[PDB]
Amino acid sequence: QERIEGEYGASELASERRPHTPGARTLLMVLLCVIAVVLVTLSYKAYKV
Amino acid sequence: ESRKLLASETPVGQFIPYSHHVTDTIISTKNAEYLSVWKIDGRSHQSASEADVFQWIRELNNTLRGISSANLSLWTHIVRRRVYEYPDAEFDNVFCRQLDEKYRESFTGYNLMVNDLYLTVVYPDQKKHRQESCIKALEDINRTLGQSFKRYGAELLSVYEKGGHAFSAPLEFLARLVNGEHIPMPICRDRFSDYMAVNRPMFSKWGEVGELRSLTGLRRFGMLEIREYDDATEPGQLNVLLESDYEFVLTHSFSVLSRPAAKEYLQRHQKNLIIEEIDEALNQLISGHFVMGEHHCTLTVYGETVQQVRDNLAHASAAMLDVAVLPKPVDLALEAGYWAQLPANWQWRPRPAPITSLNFLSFSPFHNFMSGKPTGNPWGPAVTILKTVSGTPLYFTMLIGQSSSGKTVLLGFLLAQAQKFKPTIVAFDKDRGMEISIRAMGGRYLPLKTGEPSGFNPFQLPPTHANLIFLKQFVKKLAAAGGEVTHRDEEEIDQAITAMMSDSIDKSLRRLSLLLQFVHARLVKWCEGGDYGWLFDNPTDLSTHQIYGFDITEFLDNPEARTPVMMYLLYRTESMIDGRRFMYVFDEFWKPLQDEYFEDLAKNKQKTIRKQNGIFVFATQEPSDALESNIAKTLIQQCATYIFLANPKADYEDYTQGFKLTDSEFELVRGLGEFSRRFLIKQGDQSALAEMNLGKFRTIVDGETVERDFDDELLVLSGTPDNAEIAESIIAEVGDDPAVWLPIFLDRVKAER
Amino acid sequence: QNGIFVFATQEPSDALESNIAKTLIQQCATYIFLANPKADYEDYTQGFK
Amino acid sequence: EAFPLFKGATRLPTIWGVPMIPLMAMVMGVAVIALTVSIWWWALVPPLWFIMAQITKNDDKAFRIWWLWIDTKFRNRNKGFWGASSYSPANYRKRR
């Protein structure tokens, strides 16, 4: 009932992963933090007006 | 679920644009785009001056610009591949078996890969009209390309029949493009698109590498792409991928483009830029000196595991960056690129970027290292495989060059490895060098020398009228010391020979001395008790063995005797050639051949013999001394496979005028070392400075670097009268069999060493 | 097994001509050239690298 | 002495610096948006048009690669089952 031994199963290509440049995550997060505080203050004035 | 998943697939036929052969050289397409494939033996690039490759590109572009219709296209294809077709050869001689096992041991860790170039120039009643129009146009294109590739050794691929069925020659190549293997594609009763793929490909969702699931094993391929040129189109800048350690398939495309459209593209560049460079560019384009076209190059490396194919891809990227064409691996369009290799697929090309035509012919000058043909030869497999200084192995006649530089070593090596064909050999050598080898190959070697009885004589010859003609001719040629032979002399000799060779005289009694009883005074010297009585007046006078040898060393100083000795030996060997693989060889040819008699017989019987598997393997120590005479001229011009050797002294006149050797190649030959083993093979127009070498090396067996040396076979093959004069002693003491006395000969060698 | 050849010469022109001297010129690691009022381009460049 | 190569390569036919085919795709998309939701939406043109100009100027033929991927490796149905996109060699055209 198990996959049959020593045959070609699914591909070995699905193991592939896209590497991340190890600076994108941290600075992207900080950039969104600052842009978000700007946008929230902006909608604070939006509703206040 | 099996059928449900089955029927819901996109077959590979959607991506393969081919159909019935319409002409024996031209393949149709569902869009009616007829094409032909051009197998090319790319001319050498290493052995040429830098300006001369420019000249080659000039000639090639000049021929192209005549026929480059706005409807054309080109797909070059340099499919680097490793050789699986080279069968191990059976053998009988122990010495040959040892030599071949050692030699094939010397190839552990060598690039055994051969380049294979290509080119595919692409192009109801009115459907038929379009049919003949396209066929005639493409057939003219094929004729023009054939006439333009005279020095490129091109061969148009066409249908060949095997076993009462049609097998396509191009379809095998295009299938190799699709499958990654070489599956012999027959001509069945469907569209080729239906049944031309026998390997289920698999492409990664996010990546550059794929995988071909075949019976014989998986092959993982990683494509690559060129996207950034530079301010240069230096000739053959993509040569670096010829020397690769990774088996791949390069690709190109040149969708030739209309002069108005090309002029508009160049006007666009001019406008964006806006001096003199584009002035001359546009002026040439109008004046018809190049034809722009849309181009794309996709190197695809083949490998066995995904890590290794990525490693090869990084290597290829480094190689391309070395020659200033910035490559970027194809990632999103891997499948589009892989379907963009099959000729007649423009809709699948990733990055078509217009370029000058000179430039395209500079991305594919059809350069190639000389490699030769492993299989398919008239005899079968290739005789030997030789190291090349370039690195790519050559899958191997007139040897010329000052001796002791391995000429006897080389000829012994070839004649020792050529026994996979079971060929007859007849070796006229000089200075007893080949005696040891010819004995080792288990054949008779006659060591002719002055003062000892000759051992063979025409006394017992067959009596047929043709043989009577020959023997009359011989005695008319033997007669020389006496003086001029008159008509009366001829009649006397004829009557005497006829009478002697009658049924009334016993064969055992027939000798030159007996002939005298039937010109007399002049023949006395050739009879017993005379100056030459030891040669042809023996009491008793060849089908036993295979590899014969005869020594004619003392005959270089003999004006008279060369004609009789060579006449008799050659006549005896003439009856041998009845279709069996026969290999005449020689040494310092001209002096044996410096005879007024048999130059005409040699040329005529040469044309005759060449039919039933005949070969002449000449040789020479002083090529200057040979080209002077008349006889050597026809033989220099009648040898296909030159093999030049080195010399501290060289002359321009002989090497260029006589031997059809170019100036760059001649300077290359001069540049060779004095005793460095390096010989320039020149089969045809192609050249390659190969070198068979017998140096120290290591063997990868059981993790043991078993030091293996070829000197135990060098002191056998190498010519040495000293070594031969003790080899003869040891054979005299024990002459049982070369398979038997070989260890004890090596023993006595170790005793003197 | 720790062997050394320390050659010498007075007229390098006279040596490079013969066959035997060629292998020995190419088989010496440590050249030591000396001066001469008479010199020739061919010998010094072609033979002695 | 190398044969000159001019940089009229992949200088695609462009209006405003953008190729015809992708810009027509944007025109069709923005027209669809304008006809669908609201008519104030031809202001969606300049932002994406400028981003497309910046994309094309940097890498002249991005859109051809995009379309090739979308057409081939995105359509192929059984990407998940095989672990990779695969096309059956035997021509199963659903016939018998």
Q: Which of D1, D11, D61 sits opposite B54 (nearest CB)?
A: D1
CA distance B53 to B233: 13
C-alpha distances out from residue B179 to B26, B29, B202, B217, B518, Å: 21, 19, 11, 12, 80
Give B648's contacts in chain C (Cβ within 8 Å).
Answer: 19, 22
| Resolution of the experimental structure, in angstroms | 4.3
Q: Is D15 on the interface with B (CB under 8 A)?
A: no
Q: How many CB atoms lie within 10 A of CB B41?
A: 23
- Kindly determine whether residue D2 and residue B232, on different chains, have CB atoms separated by under 8 Å: yes
C-alpha distances out from residue B320 to B117, B195, B207, B224, B228, Å: 19, 36, 21, 11, 11
Identify any residues that bridge with B583 across adjacent strands, giving them in sequence order.
B425, B615
CA distance B185 to B482: 72
Say whether the A–C interface has 3 or more Cβ pairs within 8 Å.
no
Closest CA relative to residue B435, chosen from B415, B405, B452, B453: B415
| Cβ within 8 Å of residue B24, ≥6 positions away | B158, B159
Handedness of CA B645, B651, B654, B660 (dihedral sign): positive
CA-atom Rg of chain B in angstroms: 32
Q: What is the count of residue pairs from B and C with beta carbons less than 8 Å apart?
A: 10
C-alpha distances out from residue B637 to B311, B467, B530, B631, B661, Å: 49, 32, 42, 11, 12
CA distance B145 to B563: 50
Tokens of B314: 């990084």
8 Å CB contact between B249 and B80: yes
DSSP conformation class of B157: -
3-class DSSP state for residue B504? coil
Closest CA relative to residue B527, chosen from B517, B538, B514, B513: B513
DSSP conformation class of B61: H
Q: Which of D1, D73, D94 sits opposite B205 (nearest CB)?
A: D73
CA distance B408 to B715: 11
Question: What DSSP string runs through B618-663?
Answer: B--S-HHHHHTSHHHHHHHHT-SEEEE---SS--HHIIIIITT--H
- Kindly determine whether residue A12 and residue B211, on different chains, have CB atoms separated by under 8 Å: yes
Any idea which residue has 């095989």 for tokens?
A: D82
3-class DSSP state for residue C48? coil
Write out B117-133 in H/E/C secondary structure: ECEEEECCHHHHHHHHH
Give D81's contacts in chain A (Cβ within 8 Å).
Answer: 10
CA distance B375 to D12: 48
Helix (H) or strand (E) holding B32: none
8 Å CB contact between B208 and B330: yes
Tokens of B328: 């970027």
DSSP conformation class of B432: T
Helix (H) or strand (E) holding A1: none
- Kindly determine whether residue D8 and residue B268, on different chains, have CB atoms separated by under 8 Å: yes
Q: How many CB atoms lie within 10 A of CB B413?
A: 22
3-class DSSP state for residue B73? coil
Q: Which of D4, D11, D83 sits opposite B265 (nearest CB)?
A: D11
8 Å CB contact between B619 and B585: yes
Handedness of CA B513, B516, B521, B522 (dihedral sign): negative
Give B206's contacts in chain A (Cβ within 8 Å).
Answer: 16, 18
| Mutation choice for C interface testing from B674, B675, B676, B678 by most C CBs within 10 A | B674
C-alpha distances out from residue B276 to B282, B283, B292, Å: 10, 10, 19
Helix B94-105 × helix B738-752 angle, to 10°: 60
Triad B301, B306, B310: Cα angle to 5°:
55
Any idea which residue has 């030739």 for tokens?
A: B256
Identify any residues that bridge with B41 across adjacent strands, giving them in sequence order.
none
C-alpha distances out from residue B583 to B287, B297, B427, B610, B613, Å: 57, 47, 9, 11, 8
CA end-to-end distance (rounded Å), chain B: 79
Tokens of B204: 């990664």
Helix (H) or strand (E) holding D1: none
Question: What DSSP string runs through B186-200?
Answer: B--SS-HHHHS--SE
- Kindly determine whether residue D91 and residue B194, on different chains, have CB atoms separated by under 8 Å: yes
| Cβ within 8 Å of residue A46, ≥6 positions away | none
Tokens of B8: 């819901």
Burial letters for B586-623: b for 16+ Cβ neighbours within 10 Å, e otherwise? bbbbbbbbbbeebbeebeeeeeebeeebbbbbbbbbbb
DSSP-derived pairing of the beta strands B445-446 and B398-400: unpaired
- Kindly determine whether residue B648 and residue C23, on different chains, have CB atoms separated by under 8 Å: no
Tokens of B78: 């340099």
| Cβ within 8 Å of residue B562, ≥6 positions away | B552, B555, B591, B592, B594, B595
C-alpha distances out from residue B741 to B100, B409, B430, Å: 20, 22, 24
Identify any residues that bridge with B355 across adjacent strands, giving them in sequence order.
B293
Tell me how close the Cα of B718 comes to any Cα of chain C, in angstroms: 19
Question: What DSSP string runs through D34-88?
Answer: HHHT-SGGGGSHHHHHHHHHHHHHHSTTHHHHHHHHHHHTTT-STHHHHSSEE--
Give B209's contacts in chain A (Cβ within 8 Å).
Answer: 13, 16
CA distance B684 to B688: 11
Backbone φ, ψ for residue B293 (5° rounding): -165, 165
Any idea which residue has 């069709």 for tokens?
A: D28
Closest CA relative to residue B178, chosen from B195, B155, B156, B190: B195
Backbone φ, ψ for residue B148 (5° rounding): -85, -15
CA distance B166 to B750: 60
DSSP-derived pairing of the beta strands B424-429 and B326-327: unpaired
CA distance B177 to B37: 13
Question: What DSSP string runs through B372-391?
Answer: --SS--SSSS-S-EE-BTTS
Triad B52, B57, B60: Cα angle to 5°:
125
Q: Is B306 on the interface with A (CB under 8 A)?
A: yes
Identify any residues that bridge with B40 across adjacent strands, giving them in sequence order.
B117
Strands (E), B235-351: 248-249, 254-256, 293-295, 300-303, 326-327
3-class DSSP state for residue B515? helix
Query: Least CA distance to C46: which residue of chain B?
Result: B671
8 Å CB contact between B325 and B228: yes
Strands (E), B512-569: 547-551
Burial letters for B656-667: b for 16+ Cβ neighbours within 10 Å, e otherwise? eebbebbebbbe
8 Å CB contact between B38 and B121: yes
Please tell me which chains touch A, using 3 or more CB pairs under 8 Å as the contact test: B, D
Helix (H) or strand (E) holding B690: strand B688-690
Helix (H) or strand (E) holding B160: strand B160-161
8 Å CB contact between B432 and B721: yes
- Kindly determine whether residue C19 and residue B673, on different chains, have CB atoms separated by under 8 Å: no
Q: How many CB atoms lie within 10 A of CB A43?
A: 9
Q: Which of B195, B205, B266 sits opposite D6 (nearest CB)?
A: B266
3-class DSSP state for residue B589? coil
CA distance D12 to B352: 10
D interface toward A at CB cutoff 8 Å? 81-84
Q: Which amino acid is at B303?
A: G
| Cβ within 8 Å of residue B242, ≥6 positions away | B78, B80, B115, B367, B368, B369, B392
**D 24-83 residues with CB < 8 A to B:** 61, 64-66, 68-69, 72-73, 75-79, 81-83
Closest CA relative to residue B169, chosen from B179, B178, B161, B180: B161
CA distance B390 to A31: 56
Any idea which residue has 């089952």 for tokens?
A: D81
Helix B50-67 × helix B125-148 angle, to 10°: 160
Q: Which of B54, B229, B235 sits opposite D5 (nearest CB)?
A: B229
Q: Is B335 on the interface with A (CB under 8 A)?
A: no
CA distance B203 to B462: 76
Question: What DSSP string runs through B223-268?
Answer: E--EEE-BSB--TTGGGGGGG-SS-EE----EEE--HHHHHHHHHH
CA distance B16 to B31: 12
